[PDB]
Design a protein around this ligand. Sequence first.
Ligand code: ZN
Ligand code: ZN
Ligand code: ZN
Length: 100
Amino acid sequence: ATGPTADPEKRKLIQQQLVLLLHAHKCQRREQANGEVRACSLPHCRTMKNVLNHMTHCQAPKACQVAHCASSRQIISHWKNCTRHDCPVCLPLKNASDKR
Ligand SMILES: [Zn+2]
Ligand SMILES: [Zn+2]
Ligand SMILES: [Zn+2]
């Protein structure tokens, strides 16, 4: 559920979806900044980049009930609404972005 779900697979999958969505945005700009040679090899990154491009073409986002897209928009909507200084996935990402 979108609620305080405690199921461990939900924990890892939801946090990985959000982290790879942000990686897909990052890595799309990074790739576009070169436009002639690749800069990534993470197996799931290309799938999430495709899901992100779909969310850009999409018109329902959340009601676009397809597992990957509906999930993608629910996690990124959480990240958009977030108060991030003390959240279970927010705090990790904040440490994962301490420098650039
Ligand atoms: Zn990547
Ligand atoms: Zn969609
Ligand atoms: Zn959060």
